[PDB]
Amino acid sequence: IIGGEFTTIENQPWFAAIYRRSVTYVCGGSLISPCWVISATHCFIDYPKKEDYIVYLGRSRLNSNTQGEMKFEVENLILHKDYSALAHHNDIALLKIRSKEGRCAQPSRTIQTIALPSMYNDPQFGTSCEITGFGKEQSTDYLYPEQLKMTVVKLISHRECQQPHYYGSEVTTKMLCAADPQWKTDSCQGDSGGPLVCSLQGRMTLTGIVSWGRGCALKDKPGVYTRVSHFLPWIRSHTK
């Protein structure tokens, strides 16, 4: 997260921290149900083996064990069969979680689920949503921050993101662009798979999943997110 502010998991109780076995951070995710975390396929496409992954819920620091946190194994790693790639299509994935005790996540003050959107029902463009993650704080940074961060970006219409000086056609209707009017804040490397959360009809909703972007917080280069309200059938079937 470029700019923005630091926060603790309490403010984003659905945020999942995903790691791969050296134990290195991979990407974020979002808890949509006790046993299911949703994220981005590009984060695992190169190492599909579900055995190399560790998912944490209720964790606020990168390399420290936030008290009240829960460690899980990936029972099932479901990548979208139609994935293609920056410009990344169908960049969405599901991780079925279960602890060694063989159980799913238990809600608490630091562990909650996030509601899914209604099909093709997204906030009006210009709306302000939140993005959370352990991604770089600066494009030039070589390290990821130790403390969780979040910031605010505004939804951008596909017509405007479609423009050549922006992303041209690299962006599709299955994608949502979001950015700061001053391009002062944005998601960056390491935030992929993380949640783009918007308020809809008085309810925090998982409108997007950090997917890709040209650099970070660069003028005319929005952050691109997988448009969740366009993948509900896919999500429900694979989570039955």
Partner: peptide, 12 residues
């Protein structure tokens, strides 16, 4: 390899 989309990618 520095942008979103290429994390945890072998080539990188």
């Amino acid at each position: 390899c520095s942008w979103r989309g290429l994390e945890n990618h072998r080539m990188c």
